């Protein structure tokens, strides 16, 4: 009852933080091209050179 009601809830809660994290990386990572562009458009207000 400790393994099942105490330590597995936390290992699984951990298995969820690590999925969210691994994803936020992979979001900043696959949309790398988009995210840069959308930055320097933000910085030149729509026209960049």
């Amino acid at each position: 009852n400790y393994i099942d009601k105490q330590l597995l809830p936390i290992v699984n809660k951990q298995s969820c933080s690590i999925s969210n994290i691994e994803t936020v990386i992979e979001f900043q990572q696959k949309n790398n091209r988009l995210l840069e562009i959308t930055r320097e458009f933000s910085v030149n207000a729509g026209v960049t050179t």
Binding site: Y2, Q6, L7, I10
Partner: protein, 49 residues
């Protein structure tokens, strides 16, 4: 002189001799608190039984 005069109107066009002070803006931020939960086992009640 830019001491005495802050504006000069010339006809229908208004020149500004001194820069016009504006609203002051503030963006407030509160410290982010990291929290975790250590998982502690009751060995003493168990090492007795």
């Amino acid at each position: 002189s830019n001491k005495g005069v802050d504006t000069v109107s010339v006809g229908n066009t208004l020149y500004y001799v001194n820069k016009q002070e504006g609203k002051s803006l503030y963006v407030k931020g509160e410290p982010i608190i990291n929290f975790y939960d250590p998982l502690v086992f009751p060995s003493d009640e168990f090492d007795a039984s």
